[PDB]
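Hi R.,

Here are the chain sequences for the assembly we discussed:
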Amino acid sequence: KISGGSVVEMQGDEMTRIIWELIKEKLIFPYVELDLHSYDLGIENRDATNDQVTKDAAEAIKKHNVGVKCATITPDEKRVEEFKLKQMWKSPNGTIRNILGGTVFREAIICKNIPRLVSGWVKPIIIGHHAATDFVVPGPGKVEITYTPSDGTQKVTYLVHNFEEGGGVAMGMYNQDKSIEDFAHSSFQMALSKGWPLYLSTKNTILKKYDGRFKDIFQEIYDKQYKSQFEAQKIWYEHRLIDDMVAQAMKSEGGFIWACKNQSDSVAQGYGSLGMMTSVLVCPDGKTVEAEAAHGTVTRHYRMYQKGQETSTNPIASIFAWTRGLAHRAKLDNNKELAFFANALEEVSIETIEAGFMTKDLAACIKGLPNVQRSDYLNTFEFMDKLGENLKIKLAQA
Amino acid sequence: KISGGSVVEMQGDEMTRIIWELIKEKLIFPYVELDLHSYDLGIENRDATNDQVTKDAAEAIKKHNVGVKCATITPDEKRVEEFKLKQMWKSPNGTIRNILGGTVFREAIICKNIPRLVSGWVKPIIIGHHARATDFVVPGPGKVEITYTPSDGTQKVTYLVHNFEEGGGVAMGMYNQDKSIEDFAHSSFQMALSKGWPLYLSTKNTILKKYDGRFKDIFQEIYDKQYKSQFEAQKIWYEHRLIDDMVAQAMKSEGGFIWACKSDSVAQGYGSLGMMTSVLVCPDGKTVEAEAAHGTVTRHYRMYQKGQETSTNPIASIFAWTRGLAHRAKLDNNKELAFFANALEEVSIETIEAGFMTKDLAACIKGLPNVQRSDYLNTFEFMDKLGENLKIKLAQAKL
Ligand SMILES: NC(=O)C1=CN([C@@H]2O[C@H](COP(=O)(O)OP(=O)(O)OC[C@H]3O[C@@H](n4cnc5c(N)ncnc54)[C@H](OP(=O)(O)O)[C@@H]3O)[C@@H](O)[C@H]2O)C=CC1
Ligand SMILES: NC(=O)C1=CN([C@@H]2O[C@H](COP(=O)(O)OP(=O)(O)OC[C@H]3O[C@@H](n4cnc5c(N)ncnc54)[C@H](OP(=O)(O)O)[C@@H]3O)[C@@H](O)[C@H]2O)C=CC1
Ligand SMILES: CC(C)[C@H]1COC(=O)N1c1ccnc(N[C@@H](C)c2ccccc2)n1
Ligand SMILES: CC(C)[C@H]1COC(=O)N1c1ccnc(N[C@@H](C)c2ccccc2)n1
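And here is the predicted structure of the full complex:
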């Protein structure tokens, strides 16, 4: 088997837990040997360890640079009573990002037989977003926002609003330079890693100081640190006003990175393609990545699975979490064998869908869900078997 | 002719001004007579009156309740050079909106043969936008605070925004008045009742629990005290959504709801700004100002001056009139004018659905680069065809 090296894996919850184990059993473990740092972030085990497993998983990603994560339940009030949780544990994803830093980039997987929301988008678009004290104003009065330098030599007082005719609400927000810089570095690394050009969108016409700082810091870091590496790959970096970016992006064919300063997984859910959207946290050092599906645990399918009904859950996004993590491991290690495997598994997935073997969501995307009949699609396990069979052929032929 | 009553009109600039006159002369005046209160907000008349004609027009709307407005040039540094005018006057639409107040609602015009960005959207969705931050650079370490000082001399309240311990960054403050939020709510309920469609408000009140929670609370309070009964009598409702759920729900919907949001760009990228209409809906439920959501279409106006054939879409400008006229008809219980407004909209939709369209519409079918001259009509050709179809429909209606 391929010697794969150090990968941090995080097990999860409900329907994605099922698919995750299938991915390891049928598509990864038959071909790759991993020095696997495996952490169980299932809700019950987070409860039993008082969420310590989540913090330990994040520490492992930092040490070993490659994380692949299965979808996890984020507790709310009803989860607390469903599992009798000791408390409403915080989102594992927030815990991990707070420890790793970095920027989340989402990317759709595109197949030629599958409609796109914007049909001219024939190459994927990779979108990353940059990730407040608010209060109630009880009645008339001035709200002001002040800055006091550490030396105390000055004191600038900006008027937010003079409320004259009632109360309302107000808020202050901020960003540290370092956070903007990290967002730049991650974005530049994303673009170099994929070999695609990079756009930053802001509303610097309106937030001239706040958003102009994003623009200035991106351009300064580009000029000092990345411009040669971009010109070596014949890619480029530009700023856009968000108004123009949206119009230009919709007239584009795709194949660019879009760093967005002001969600896309919500459009995917509305469109019915969450199972085809992957996600990757990109740390600004360019070394550490955490890959995962953009969707959740798919509870509604899992209740169906629990009741004996047939499930047609799309495993592609979860598969591409593995391939993206392994491809990155291959890049850090110059593992040609691994790189070939990771790429081959992505090709197999797209070839299989493009030959008409797909889950119910993809069939509904072609035909519309009302017109979908059961023979137009495979169920979760049929689809995985077909992918396993096509992966066996593809790897054997080389 | 049909008696129309009192309508405030605002003429405008460049390509829209030319479309504007073709509409009155071919589509409105042959069949309707109006107590028309006209105001010329063309850039020249706006300079030559120190932008006074603009605020007179806004007062006329306040008084007469119905305004219809052509698109107007907003001045920038290149505009002042163009007409050698005396100042970089403010947007006529900002002037108008702070005299009247109220919420801008946008609505696309749908035709069966013109593809939609979301195929399942067969009925229009109406988006209501609430519409000022103070932002600055933080140059180095220090404290950013935001404070509230009551106007009655009582104790100021201080909120820590951030201690910058190393380096600087940026900060800003934002605000919203209860009255603006209450007006937004009223305008939104009014708009949902006039159309007979349910209403959704979207916020992110899970993160900004005080700021956005204020919007959610004001909408709900006002809904219960003054609107729930009238809503339940048109089989519609009001509900609040987190923005994530609202985006998903909306894309799975069929359309036909009001979305109060706490859009133009997507229309421009999709190529459908010519099919996008707008209406300023004041909180009283009596005053509207209707207009195309697009601008003066400068780029086509230049082709018009250089003797080039143009194919600028007039539908959204026509619907400024029809929506203004429909609202004027509802105020006056004028059934004859309500019929004309509705019929001019249906004529417009049907003409397109029969294959007679301007070049942008043809491009939604064939693809932006793939239109040829035989696929569409030019601006004046299209107006004639509307005019002919409008005559035929009004003749066949007296039965
Ligand atoms: N990164 C993470 O760990 C995330 C975890 N979550 C967690 O997931 C749980 C459930 O969240 P929920 O709001 O239902 O969001 P999910 O994304 O889990 O599911 C939402 C809907 O999108 C469709 N969908 C999502 N994934 C697939 C797929 N792989 N194949 C086919 N269809 C798919 C299904 O729609 P349909 O019903 O129409 O088939 C599904 O019901 C929650 O506990 C939440 O905390 C949520 C987001 C991220
Ligand atoms: N409420 C108002 O009065 C508004 C006025 N304006 C003003 O209008 C002027 C021009 O602004 P601009 O940025 O060009 O915005 P416009 O909305 O006038 O035009 C933008 C582009 O969108 C397309 N488009 C818009 N309307 C139509 C239509 N009716 N038929 C066909 N295509 C259309 C055209 O694209 P293509 O180039 O592909 O043909 C046009 O070049 C400015 O002076 C601005 O201040 C702007 C917004 C609102
Ligand atoms: C609309 C989107 C959910 C999917 C479904 O259908 C498409 O055409 N989609 C495409 C097509 C290419 N590239 C993407 N990338 C993602 C990250 C994206 C999300 C949101 C906006 C832009 C871009 N999405
Ligand atoms: C995408 C949009 C520009 C037009 C063009 O294509 C459509 O199918 N569009 C539709 C279809 C129904 N309803 C709308 N309403 C507008 C106000 C809107 C704009 C933006 C978002 C939501 C809703 N737009």
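Chain B touches chain A through 68 residues (CB under 8 Å). Residues 1-399 of chain B form a domain with the Isopropylmalate Dehydrogenase fold (CATH 3.40.718.10).

Let me know if anything looks off.

Best,
T.
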